[model samples]
Target: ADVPAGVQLADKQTLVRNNGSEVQSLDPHKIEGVPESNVSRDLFEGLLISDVEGHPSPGVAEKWENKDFKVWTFHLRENAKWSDGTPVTAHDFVYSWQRLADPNTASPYASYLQYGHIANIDDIIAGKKPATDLGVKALDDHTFEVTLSEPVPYFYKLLVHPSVSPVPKSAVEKFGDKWTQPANIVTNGAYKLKNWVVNERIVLERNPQYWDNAKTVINQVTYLPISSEVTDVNRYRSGEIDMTYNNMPIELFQKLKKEIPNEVRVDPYLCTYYYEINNQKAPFNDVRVRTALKLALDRDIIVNKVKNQGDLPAYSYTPPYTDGAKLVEPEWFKWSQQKRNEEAKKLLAEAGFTADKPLTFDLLYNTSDLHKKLAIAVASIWKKNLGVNVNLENQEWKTFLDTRHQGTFDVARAGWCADYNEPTSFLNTMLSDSSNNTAHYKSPAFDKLIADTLKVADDTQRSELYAKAEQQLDKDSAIVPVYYYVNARLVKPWVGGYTGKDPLDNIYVKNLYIIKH
Candidate 1:
């Protein structure tokens, strides 16, 4: 049997993987994109890391205990060492988290600290207090403590996020913004950066000093950034790549299930795909207009015809099977297609729109063949059902994010994958004050429910509060929920220990090994 071209069994155990998108940055606190998170996961060690099942496990910190609901103490591994041979101490995590919450650092994910309820986090992010005043502290060389304003059920899982990963202060201070370059980086994970060729590939070699190095099977890993779905499929079939993280064409996905069933992996991914209606602008500011657009969409067609994967039509912002949460589907979503169309037409007319005086708006999406197809299908549905003229616009990822944040477009594509396994991960983003609220929707009732939900310690009570909060979005048509995602991936049968079901899509190379026949 011929091995994959990139596989080298003689020299070292190596895994060549496709990251799907170009890494925006490797700095733990500064990066936001998913591709960057994958790189950071390999290079940096946090207090806790997620396993294939999305459960929190020991990383640099060997053990932890909650003294009270609000106080957490972590005992770091004495053997943990950075790539540069320095000890991985408790202070590393303290400094890293403080920097993330520091307003001066301008980390876009700074809000995560506030959401996690870190004591004094709000004051630090608002520039009212020093970063040192943030709730984390180093009690000793290997002891770390964190104080939260309140108990957070999902706090442990949040530690795996890159924003909380440890950063060696010396290297960062020395290299400044260029600290992430392969030559300057210092990591404490199973791998260390070997090389980074922009827009091409990144190479990582085993960290010889890693505390668990003896158990880590792969000696080296290479990540290739291939953004085009067609190109990724071709590369995977030709044996130029071992795995792809994203962008498998829908047609090819269906074909692979039949032609090469063993190579395909599909699972329920905790993500919601939707379009954000700019409530700050005209036409969209009208609730009737927004409702009309949402009601007119045939989510089943989009999922079955346009997507053709196992994507479920989304009736609520939160996806199904989320931990500690019940699925919610609104009454409006239960209406038949004929009833929805009638209601949509009535809403459009009530909003002072008609076939002659048609409502026109642009639908914006990030550049991708899948997104383009979805946009075209949605546009067609709107034109055929409601007699609306919808203009389609596509932009590169970076530009698309900026455009959506700036609220420049009429209706823009949006998706949210759970940062942690909770309904709050999806519901919190819709809060009026949330930085991720790109739609600029303001609802006092909706905001209050989230606030009240946070105060309740009972899981059942909190979930009920969250359900009520989500219902407000449906009533107001805050945004259109098109579909819930299913990750359709291609993994080699020889690969082992890859779950591919993590809500965050996190892949721990340390857990992966190749099987020889």
Candidate 2:
């Protein structure tokens, strides 16, 4: 058994949805996956909102100004009220941001502030200073200020992440971790926690106190943590679900698209699927062996045939959707499969692997028919190309994350969705000390390249630096780039204002309505 972890209402039947897996937590600071994010987006409002179109726009903070991209001031909208009907304040944001930066919080996304270049973030996170020393402050009941260590052009977008969403200080102090439960939670978004049935369903209802309630037509929403894609589709077809999760069984994709053309949504999603190689353990400790595995991956087959989701084969860790970036591909990316196989064999041989004593590793993926299909396909590719033996294993979502966290697997299935429209969201995860660095990849050179990017304020220079960092990631070969993802979900025709346009695939019930079809 593994541990895990919202909504609104239209004045119609509840909008039931398939969120795919159990969320880890909804403490805002502790959420680690897309599933939790799906619920949290409706339950909390941050300083800057990600609009239905995926652009950063006004939310709690009606307007904001910046100085040299280093200092920012946000003017809170007085009309913004919490679900309890209390006025939301800038001080709450100060408290929430501090908690996110505090080491005691143990948030996987704690480095988020560091990525945003918040002033004194390093000192506070490194324990040289207390959380009170963080750079965010409440200038007044309606004004918030932040000072950054350096200029960050994408800083505003960073505020859209849930980690910076305000919390009810009194509730947290009183309830501790129980503040997120429906009975105790105080929220400021269009929807609020109403009921939570772990591993089964989580229901949320519209908050009458929401400042923007007039525009939020959906009155209630329900998220079922259904792990099986085939079952999710069955539910959708049975009319028990309004939308399916982002993935379905590949075999059914074309059939469903043809049968229900308007209901099926396939869009460009900013996510990269990869296998996190355990760099600290053998035989992956050897870069040659790592590169051999990377070289042998038949990403095209995995994306086009097995996934059949129109996903783009990824040759680099950072997806192309980030800041209009392109992959800084390794030399092997352009090589023909035959050429790559030959080279992979030579590398494996040099790494002391022979056909009789072939290199073997366990491939661990979370519970997904789609993930299983891809795993089997990639394993066969490795066996055929490099004479490698792969053992495939599947675990529930939380246990899978734990397995990678405990560094017990040779390689584990992984995906990175951008928290913001920047390469740093992906690149920062590989930092040696990052809490989310599952591979435990250590590259002083790579870390230095990322650190140097902060000093250069120009976007072109930052892109150049990003290229160098990515090239280093390729050279290290600790992460095997698989493919960039496409958002695939089934939304019923009556689910109006449904937009998977957000690169992160964030679906907000507030932006959705039930048409009288």
Candidate 3:
């Protein structure tokens, strides 16, 4: 089973490495999120892999060709195999993809599959036709063919994702109800799940059958779930754990940063934490009301004191660091905080609200020290700026997410992290349509901008189009962007093999090679 947080780093040598030896046995269709998708990446391979520099290159498929810029033919590696000694075939990939695209699965990521290469999938999910009528097909065991409804430039990059990975039919048949469960799960990657207990740790063992088994260093690894920040940090300090992340207190962060700057560092996360107002509801339906609420936020105070300067202030939904560029700030920052009291007063007055009017609303937030601090601070600012009183409601994390999905609140705090290394991954999901757009925001122009960019085949054009779409979002205030997440983790100095990358808190255990000192 994966350890409590996964694995315990015994010393420096064992802490700083990624173990790439594992394989997957289940289909990509059965999973969601990085935790679920990582299974597919381990058991099977995709048609292409985005290289280290972020360009798509051949993966399991050695080469591919385009037919009229709409149909794509991918030739799979002849030597690719499943962990059970079965040959990895094109039909395996097709089955996995069509299953994912199936409307019955109700996958949130279903819309993303249609972005470029899988454009026809959109119509399929919408009940236009059956999978057979869709664009994907297997020419043979090693050849995969796909037809696009529109021109897609980043199709290759999409292949790197688990949605495009191969699957094992036998594994599913053998496991039956327990297919995705630990014991029954089969992997084709450098490792395999040896044991898994829900809310407990998951254990992984090196897979001798993996294609890259020879490269695997560590033989076993674990995933442990320690939600309490103090407990997580304590375990690391006591040499009982290797890593812990998310929701660290400001005092602990300051103490750690001063003592171990290298171990306690801040890196930008792909997530943008913000507030969304439900326009379908009263009060919030008025743009003036929305603007008034926005103007009332004391972002500088929240960022500096409550967020502990760990998060960067955000005025736009899209973070500035997405497209190899920093945001054009000062101006944006000005919009976020300038004339706060005056703007709030003006907007409230225009909305027919006066100093005597009692506009009471609830501010929904998660239960955490930082969240409580932020909620209280914003409530104070709103009361001061507009004479509007807001009730702060704190719920458990899971319950909060459930309520958000059900649209049960007037105004709530929510955030999104990028699934892939693309700008559209965030923008499209947040505002494209009613499904992924939790805000229930609809804009004809915003939709057009995203759709137009996705249809283009040029990289620069697509990037520019996304940027323009973000600007439109900024103007509409469809989403009140607050701050980009800068995750700060405290690690013991003895942990040596761990590393960090932009946008993702990724660690690979097989790369870890412990030297007994």
Best model number under lDDT: 2
lDDT of 1 by residue, 1-517 (tens): 1234565444346788888667767888776666778888888989898887778888888999886568898999899999988999998888899898888787757877877889998678668899999999899989999999988767787788888988999989999998988889989888999999987899999999888888788888899887677677788888877777665676577788888888888878888899889988998888999998889999989988878888899888888678767757787789998799899999989989998899988999877767787798899999999999999988876677778778899999888888778888888787776667788899999988987876886888988887788789888899999988887778877676777767677787887877662
Model 2 lDDT per residue over 1-517, tens place: 0111123323574588899998888789987888988898899999988877889989899999999899999999999999888999989999999999999998888888888888899888899999999999899999999999888778898888888888899889999999988899999988998899889889899998998887777778999998889899988999999999988788788899899888888898889999889999988999999988888888778887778778898888899668747556667988897888888888999999967789878999999988888888989999988888999999988888888878999988899898888888889988898878889898999899999988985778888888889999998897898988888899988777666778777667888777665
- Candidate 3 versus the native: TM-score? 0.84
User: Can you give the TM-score per candidate against the true fold?
Assistant: 0.94, 0.96, 0.84
Q: Residue 326 CA error for candidate 3 (Å)?
A: 8.5
Q: lDDT per residue, candidate 3, 1-517, as tens digits?
A: 1222444544433231111112122346643344444344444567875442335666678899987667889998887666666677888878767766778756555665666547567667877876555678889988998888776644565677666666566666676547767656656665677776655665677777755566556676665544455656666667666556555665466776776677675767777888887756787777778877776777788787766757887777777777533334434347545576687788788888877986888889866555666677778877887888888898765566556667778888877766566676677765545346677677789889887875676767777777677777666667667788885676555443444454644334544455443
The residue ranges of model 3 lying beyond 4 angstroms of the native Cα positions read: 1-45, 48-59, 62-69, 171-177, 324-332, 335-338, 352-355, 366-369, 394-399, 431-434, 455-464, 492-497, 511-517
Candidate 3: count the clashes: 49
lDDT of 2 at 259: 90
lDDT of 1: 0.83
Top of the candidates by TM-score: 2
Candidate 1 lowest-lDDT run of ten: 1-10
After best superposition, candidate 3 residue 277: deviation in angstroms? 3.0
Candidates ranked, most accurate by TM-score first: 2, 1, 3
